[PDB]
Design a protein around this ligand. Structure first.
Ligand SMILES: OC[C@H]1O[C@H](O)[C@H](O)[C@@H]1O
Ligand SMILES: OC[C@H]1O[C@H](O)[C@H](O)[C@@H]1O
Lengths: 305, 305
C-alpha cells in the first residue's frame, strides 16, 4: 500500500452528554463530560493509522499541555507525527460539543493553533506530499494551506482526497485539484447549489462536482449510505444498519478507512464497504477518536457480515 | 446591612462566541474562546460582593487546578470563602457555552463537585445560616441541600431568597420555605403551570407562588423588566434599555445586587432599580463573572439616570 499524507486539524474536544440540546437562553444539566483528542484531521489520521495505512500527519498543535501530549498519543495510533508542529505561544484548537440522548451532536470549534498551519509549513512538506500516493484533507485548516497542498499533490500525481467539512463554498481553483471528494448532503448543497434529499438529487449534485474536475464523488446520505459517482456512472452503497449511540467521528472514520482500502488497491465499492464497517463500529462507541477501530476489529466485523 | 449567605454552584465556563448556534449534526467555527469562572452560585456571590454586601459563600470546588484557584479569585471579590470546600478526588463543575452574534446563549452544565455540596455540609453551616439576614440559593446545587438550608433559615428567621434556575419543578415543602423567589418566565411556567407572555399571565403565575407561601415574587420578563408582586399587589418595574452584547450572568447579577440593596434596607422598588442597574452594566460586557460591576460603577450608572 503506498503512503498517505493527512493534513488537517487537531482539537481538544470538550464533550457533554445531555438529554436534549439546550435552546436559546436555556441552561441544561447534562451527565457525562469528557475531555478527549479530536479534530477532523486527527480523527481521520487515527482512522487511517489504526485501520492499516502507512500515514504521516501534517498538523499544528499549540504548546499548552494538551498540545504537547496529543502528539505522543497520535504516535501510538500508527501515525508518523514528525510533521505535526508545535506552535509556541499558542493554544491547541478546541471543540465544544453537545451529544443528545438520541446521539446526535452540535459542534462549535475554535481554531487555536490549527490556524497556524500555513502555506509556508505546507511548502516545507513539498517532498513528503510529492512522494505520497494520497493526500487527505478537510476544511478545519486554513483554506490557503489546503489549496497549497492540493497544488503540490496535483503536480506530482498524488491523489487528492477532500472531506469538505464543515460545509463552506470552495473556489473552482481548489475543486479542479480534487480527485476524490466526500461531502455530506449539507456540504454537497453548499458546493453545488443542489439540495440533496435523494439519489436523483445526489446524481444532480455529483454532476456539478464532475463538472468542476472531480472524477470520484461520494455523497454520504446519512442512514442511507453513500452515493458513489465515478465521473458520471453512480450508485448507492448502503451502510451497515447499526445501533447509533455516539455518531461523532463517523464521517472521519469512514474517510480515513476509505483511503486505507484504496491505498491497498481495493476497488472503490470494496473500499466503501470497509470504510462503512469502520464507521459502523465507531458509532457504537463514544467520543471522536476513542471510538476508532483497529484493523483486526474491522476484519472481524466484515467476516461476520 | 446584615450578612448574606450565598449557597450554590461554582463552574469553569468554557465560552465560544459564534455567529449562529450550531444545528443538529452541524459543525460551526466560532471566533473568541474563553475559559473563565462561572456558576450561578459564584456569579450571584460575586455580584453581591462587588456591589457591597457582607457575604459568605457555601460552595464546593474540586481539587483540580481551576478549583484550587477560583477560591483565591472569589476572595478578592469581597466574599468570605471559608465555607467554600475543596472536594478531593473531584473536578470542578463545568459549563460549555455558545454565545451567538445577537448575544443570546445556550448552556450545558456538568455538576462535578457541585454535586458534593450535601445536607451534611449544609448542616455544618447551621450557625452561619441561622445568624445571617438572608440566604440566596439557585438550583445548580443538590435539591436536598437547597431544602436543608431553606429549613435552617426558615427556623431562624433568615430571609430565604431563591433564583429557581435552571428551570425545574419544586416540591411544596421547598416552596413553602421561600420568602423571595425570582423566576424567569420559563421557570414561572415550570413551577406553576402558567405560561407567561404578559403582566396578566405574570400576575396569574405570581398568585400560585403566593398560594404556595411565598410573599415576594419577582418574575423577570426579559426585556420588559420584572413583575414585582408582594403577596398579591403587583406591578411592572422596567429595566434600563441597554445595548446587549453578552447577556450571561445578567440574571445572576440582578439577583446578587438585588439582595445587597434589600440588606441595606432599601424598599423593594428601589432594590429592583439598583439590581437593574447592575444587570444593565453586566450585559454590556462579556463572560459571566468578568462582566460584574463594582459598587462605585452601579452608583455612577444610577447618578446619570
Ligand atoms: O468531525 C469530528 C470532529 O469535528 C470537530 O472538528 C471536533 O473536534 C470533532 O472531533
Ligand atoms: O447563570 C449563568 C451561569 O449558568 C451556568 O451555571 C454557567 O456556569 C454560567 O456562568
Amino acid at each position: 500500500a503506498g503512503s498517505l499524507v493527512v493534513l488537517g486539524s487537531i482539537n481538544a474536544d470538550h464533550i457533554l452528554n445531555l438529554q436534549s440540546f439546550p435552546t436559546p437562553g436555556e441552561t441544561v444539566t447534562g451527565n457525562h463530560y469528557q475531555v478527549a483528542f479530536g479534530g477532523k484531521g486527527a480523527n481521520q489520521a487515527v482512522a487511517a493509522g489504526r485501520s492499516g495505512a502507512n500515514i504521516a500527519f501534517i498538523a499544528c498543535t499549540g504548546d499548552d499541555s494538551i498540545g504537547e501530549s496529543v502528539r505522543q498519543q497520535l504516535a501510538t495510533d500508527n501515525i508518523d507525527i514528525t510533521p505535526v508542529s508545535v506552535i509556541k505561544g499558542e493554544s491547541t484548537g478546541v471543540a465544544l460539543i453537545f451529544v443528545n440522548g438520541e446521539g446526535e451532536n452540535v459542534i462549535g470549534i475554535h481554531a487555536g493553533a490549527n490556524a497556524a498551519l500555513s502555506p509556508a509549513l505546507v511548502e516545507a512538506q513539498r517532498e513528503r506530499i510529492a512522494n505520497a500516493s494520497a493526500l487527505l484533507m478537510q476544511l478545519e485548516s486554513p483554506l490557503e494551506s489546503v489549496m497549497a497542498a492540493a497544488k503540490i499533490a496535483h503536480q506530482n500525481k498524488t491523489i487528492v482526497a477532500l472531506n469538505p467539512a464543515p460545509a463552506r463554498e470552495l473556489p473552482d481553483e481548489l475543486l479542479a485539484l480534487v480527485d476524490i471528494i466526500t461531502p455530506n448532503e449539507t456540504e454537497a448543497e453548499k458546493l453545488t447549489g443542489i439540495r440533496v434529499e435523494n439519489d436523483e438529487d445526489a446524481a444532480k449534485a455529483a454532476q456539478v462536482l464532475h463538472e468542476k474536475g472531480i472524477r470520484t464523488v461520494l455523497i454520504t446520505l446519512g442512514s442511507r449510505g453513500v452515493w458513489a459517482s465515478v465521473n458520471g456512472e453512480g450508485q448507492r452503497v448502503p451502510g451497515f444498519r447499526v445501533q447509533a449511540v455516539d455518531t461523532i467521528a463517523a464521517g472521519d472514520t469512514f474517510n480515513g478507512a476509505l483511503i486505507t482500502a484504496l491505498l491497498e488497491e481495493k476497488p472503490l465499492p470494496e473500499a466503501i464497504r470497509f470504510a462503512h464497517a469502520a464507521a459502523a463500529i465507531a458509532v457504537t462507541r463514544k467520543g471522536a477518536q476513542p471510538s476508532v477501530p483497529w484493523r483486526e476489529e474491522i476484519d472481524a466485523f466484515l467476516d461476520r457480515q
